[PDB]
Ligand binder design. Structure first.
Ligand SMILES: Cc1cc2nc3c(=O)[nH]c(=O)nc-3n(C[C@H](O)[C@H](O)[C@H](O)COP(=O)(O)OP(=O)(O)OC[C@H]3O[C@@H](n4cnc5c(N)ncnc54)[C@H](O)[C@@H]3O)c2cc1C
Ligand SMILES: Cc1cc2nc3c(=O)[nH]c(=O)nc-3n(C[C@H](O)[C@H](O)[C@H](O)COP(=O)(O)OP(=O)(O)OC[C@H]3O[C@@H](n4cnc5c(N)ncnc54)[C@H](O)[C@@H]3O)c2cc1C
Ligand SMILES: COC1=C(OC)C(=O)C(CC=C(C)C)=C(C)C1=O
Ligand SMILES: COC1=C(OC)C(=O)C(CC=C(C)C)=C(C)C1=O
Ligand SMILES: COC1=C(OC)C(=O)C(CC=C(C)C)=C(C)C1=O
Ligand SMILES: *[C-]#N*
Ligand SMILES: *[C-]#N*
Lengths: 407, 405
C-alpha cells in the first residue's frame, strides 16, 4: 500500500491549510492530499460574483498552485474509509494507509433533491451562488430582472455560510434601487428557519434592514420544486405538513439543500447524522485517536465558515503535535466563527460569535452597524490573506487581534 | 427478474403492503426483499425489557408472514437506481419493477456511542431497541441493588419516541413492588427539551414525573459508555464541550438512529437520507412509480407501527388509483399513536396527527392512566398485528373514532 505519515482528505480551505501546517511539522514528503478537483475556489467571493461585483475567474486557482510545494497531490476521490486498518480507498482502485488522518471533505450540495433541479438552471431567471456552475446565473437573473417577485430561499438542512442566502437578497435589493426598478420588485425570503439569524445582536440589526427596505420573510417555508420553464416555484409549509404554495418568480436564487459528503454518510468515522465525529474542543476523532476533522464536514456545533476553518486550523495544529508526543491536548477550540453579512454594495455587518452564539467581536467598534470598512475587508483584504496567509498556514483567526485591540 | 410491485423490506410496513398489493396485482406479481429469517412485533419489547412478556413470543419466522404466493427474496438491498426502475441486492442480482414500495425501517447505530456495542457484554446495561439487548434490560432491572437508574434519549430521530421513558416508568414500578424504590435514583437524560411533543400527554406525564419522584435532565445526550466501570458520559447540548460522567447501577440505552445506510446516499432520499415522499399520498416526490411507508420515510410524524397501519390504507388507495390513471385524492393526516405504558397495568394512549394535537379514537379521556388501554396494548394489539394488519385488513382506527363520535 502507498503510505503517508499524514494523509489529508480534501484539498479545499481546510485541507490545504492543514497540509501547509503539517508540512512544517513532519516534512513535505510525509504529507499527501487527496483531491479530485483541478481547481481550488475561494468560495466567499461568490456572493459578490452573483451580485455582479466581482469576477468568477479570480475566485479560483489551479489546485496544483496551492498544494504546498513538496506535498503529494493524489488526484482522486475518496470512496471508502477503513479507520480500523488505518487506510482509505480512492476511485483509482488504490488503497492508502496513514499514521494520522485529517478529514477536510467539506459539505455536499444536493440540488437534485429539489424537483426540477439542476436541469432548471438551463432556463433564464434562476441562479445560485453556491455552485461554480450557477453563481453567474444569479447575476444574469439580477441583470435581466424587469418586474415581479425576486425570491431567495434557505433549505431545511445544515448549510455552509448561513448568511450568504440573504446577503444576495440585500445585494439584489440595492441593485433594484441603483437601476431604478425597486418599485417593480417584490422581494421575498422564504426560509426553512424560524429566525432571520441565530445571534440576537445581528438578527436585530438585520430585522431593522428588513423593515426599512420593505422585504418579506416567510418563515418555516421550504423550496421543494422548481418549474423553470414556467417560472414557478413550489414551497412547502413546514408548520402545516402537506400544505404547499406555488408562486411565480422574476428571479429565483436557490440555496441548495446540503448534507455530509456521500462517502462520509455511511462511514465508521461519522456520527449517526453522517458528519465526522470529533471532539468539540480539540478536533481529535471521538473513537479513532489518529483521526482528525476540520471544517464543514465535521459535527462541530458552530457555523460552517472558512473563518471557523481558520480558527480550527490553529487548534488542530496544536492538537496533532501533542498527540504526536503521546500527551493530552490542552488548547481548546471555542467555536469561533464569523459571518460578514454583506448588506449592500459597500456595507458589511461583521457578525462574529462562538459556541455560545454570543457576540465575540474583534474590533473595538460596534460590528452590528453596517460598515464600509468591513465591506472593504471582506471584498478585498480577505481574499488576499486567504491565498497568501491562510492557505500557507499563517492564519489561525483573529483571536490575537481581538486581545491586542482590547488593551 | 422483474415484478409489477417490488417491496423493499419485510417488516411491519413491507409485509402489510405486500398483502394489500397481492390483492391488487396478483401474488405472482409481488416480491419482498428482506434478509432476516425472523419477523418481530417490536412494540412488545417494551414489556419484555420489563419482564412482563417473553421475547420468543415477539418473533415469528419471516416465511410465516410472507403472503402466500409472494416471492420472498432473502437478501439485502445494496443500491437503488430508480431512473432505470431497478435495485441491486447483496447476492449480486438486478431486480426491476414497475412500482416500488420502500419499507426499509430505521437503522440502529449503537456504535456511534463510544464503548458500544461491546459494553453490552457487561452487566447492568440493556436496550429495549434490539433483540440482542432487550432481555439484558430485564436482567439489569432484576439485579439492580442501589444507585442511579439511567434512561437515555439520543440526539437523532427515533422510532417510538415514548419507549425510552415507558421502560423508566415500568422500572420505577418494579422497584417499588420489590422494596428497593428508596435505593434507586431514577433519571431520564434526554437530548430534547420536553418530555413529549404533544402538550396534553406531556402534561399528564409531567405529573407522573413529579408524583413518582423521577428526574428529567434536558439537553443531555449519552456519548460514551464505560461498561466495566459502570459509567456513562453525557454531553451537555446547551454548553458545547461540557460533559458529565455519571455512575449507574442500571443503564437503559436508546441508541442513535438514522436512515438505513443503503438509503443515505440513494437518489430516492431527501438530503437527510429519508425516502422523499409526498406528505399526504406517500408517492415519491421525484419518481412517480416509487412509494414509501414507515420509519424510512420523511413523513413528519412519529415513527410508529400505528402510523404504518394508517399509512398503509392511504398508500393502498394511492397506488390503486395511480394504476387506474387517476390522481390520488385521499390524504394522510399524519395519524400516529403512542401507547405510553406507565406501569405494569396502565397506559396513557396518546393519539395525534400532523398538527401534534390529540386525535383520540375512544370517547373517554386518554390522557388518564387506564387499565383498558394497557390490556389493549399488551394483549389485543399483538393479536391484531399478526392476524389483521400484516394481512392487509388494518388501516388504523379512524373508522372506530367516528363510530364512537
Ligand atoms: C456562496 C458562499 C459564500 C461564503 N461566504 C463565506 C464568508 O463570507 N465567510 C466564510 O468564512 N465562509 C464563507 N463561505 C464558506 C466557506 O467557503 C467554507 O466554509 C469553507 O470552504 C469550508 O472549507 P472546507 O475545507 O471544510 O470545505 P471546502 O473548502 O468546500 O473543500 C472541501 C473539498 O473536499 C473535496 N472533496 C469532496 N468530496 C471528496 C471526496 N470524496 N474525496 C476527496 N475530496 C473530496 C472537494 O473537492 C473540496 O475541494 C461561503 C460559502 C459559499 C458557498
Ligand atoms: C422497543 C420498541 C417499542 C415500540 N413500541 C411501539 C408501540 O407501542 N406502538 C407503535 O405503534 N410502534 C411501536 N414501535 C415502533 C414499530 O416497531 C415501528 O415503527 C414499525 O416496526 C415500523 O415499521 P417499518 O416497516 O417502517 O420498519 P420495520 O418493521 O423495522 O421493518 C424494516 C425492515 O427492513 C429490513 N431491512 C433493513 N435494511 C434492509 C436492506 N438494506 N435491505 C433489505 N431489507 C432491509 C429489516 O430487516 C426490517 O425487517 C416500537 C419500536 C421499538 C423498537
Ligand atoms: C415575517 O417576516 C416579516 C418580518 O419579520 C421578519 C417583518 O418584520 C416585516 C416588516 C414588519 C413589521 C412588523 C413592520 C415583513 C413584511 C415580513 O414579511
Ligand atoms: C474568508 O474567510 C474568513 C476568514 O478566513 C480567511 C477569517 O479569518 C475572518 C475573520 C477575520 C477578521 C480580520 C475578523 C472572516 C471574517 C472571513 O470571512
Ligand atoms: C401495534 O401498533 C399499533 C397499531 O397498529 C397495529 C394501531 O393501530 C394502534 C391504534 C389502535 C387503536 C384501537 C386505538 C396502536 C395504539 C398501536 O400501538
Ligand atoms: C455566516 N456566514
Ligand atoms: C409513541 N410511540
Amino acid at each position: 500500500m502507498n503510505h503517508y505519515e499524514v494523509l489529508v482528505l480534501g484539498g479545499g480551505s481546510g485541507g490545504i491549510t492543514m497540509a501547509a501546517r503539517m508540512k512544517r511539522k513532519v516534512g513535505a514528503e510525509n504529507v499527501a492530499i487527496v483531491e479530485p478537483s483541478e481547481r481550488h475556489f475561494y468560495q466567499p467571493i461568490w456572493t459578490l460574483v452573483g451580485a455582479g461585483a466581482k469576477q468568477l475567474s479570480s475566485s479560483g486557482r489551479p489546485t496544483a498552485s496551492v498544494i504546498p510545494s513538496g506535498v503529494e497531490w493524489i488526484k482522486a476521490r475518496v470512496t471508502e474509509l477503513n479507520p480500523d486498518k488505518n487506510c482509505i480507498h480512492t476511485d483509482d482502485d488504490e488503497k492508502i494507509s496513514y499514521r494520522y488522518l485529517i478529514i477536510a471533505l467539506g459539505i455536499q450540495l444536493d440540488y437534485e433533491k429539489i424537483k426540477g433541479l439542476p436541469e432548471g438552471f438551463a432556463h433564464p431567471k434562476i441562479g445560485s451562488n453556491y455552485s461554480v456552475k450557477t453563481v453567474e446565473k444569479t447575476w444574469k437573473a439580477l441583470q435581466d430582472f424587469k418586474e415581479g417577485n425576486a425570491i431567495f430561499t434557505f433549505p431545511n438542512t445544515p448549510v455552509k455560510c448561513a448568511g450568504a442566502p440573504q446577503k444576495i437578497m440585500y445585494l439584489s435589493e440595492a441593485y433594484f434601487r441603483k437601476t431604478g426598478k425597486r418599485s417593480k420588485a417584490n422581494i421575498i425570503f422564504n426560509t426553512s428557519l424560524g429566525a432571520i439569524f441565530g445571534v440576537k445582536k445581528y438578527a436585530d440589526a438585520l430585522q431593522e434592514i428588513i423593515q426599512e427596505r420593505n422585504l418579506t420573510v416567510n418563515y418555516k417555508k421550504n423550496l421543494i420544486e422548481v418549474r423553470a420553464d414556467k417560472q414557478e416555484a413550489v414551497f412547502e409549509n413546514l408548520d402545516k405538513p402537506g400544505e404547499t404554495q406555488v408562486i411565480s418568480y422574476e428571479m429565483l436564487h436557490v440555496t441548495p439543500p446540503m448534507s455530509p459528503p456521500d462517502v462520509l454518510k455511511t462511514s465508521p468515522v461519522a456520527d449517526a447524522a453522517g458528519w465526522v465525529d470529533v471532539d468539540k474542543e480539540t478536533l481529535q476523532h471521538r473513537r479513532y485517536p489518529n483521526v482528525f476533522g476540520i471544517g464543514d464536514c465535521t459535527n462541530l456545533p458552530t457555523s460552517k465558515t472558512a473563518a471557523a476553518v481558520a480558527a480550527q486550523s490553529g487548534i488542530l495544529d496544536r492538537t496533532i503535535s501533542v498527540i504526536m508526543k503521546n500527551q493530552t491536548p490542552t488548547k481548546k477550540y471555542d467555536g469561533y466563527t464569523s459571518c460578514p453579512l454583506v448588506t449592500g454594495y459597500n456595507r458589511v455587518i461583521l457578525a462574529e460569535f462562538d459556541y455560545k452564539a454570543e457576540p465575540l467581536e474583534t474590533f473595538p467598534f460596534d460590528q452590528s452597524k453596517e460598515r464600509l470598512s468591513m465591506y472593504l475587508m471582506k471584498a478585498d483584504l480577505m481574499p488576499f490573506l486567504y491565498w497568501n496567509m491562510m492557505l500557507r498556514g499563517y492564519w489561525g483567526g483573529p483571536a490575537f487581534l481581538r486581545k491586542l485591540f482590547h488593551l
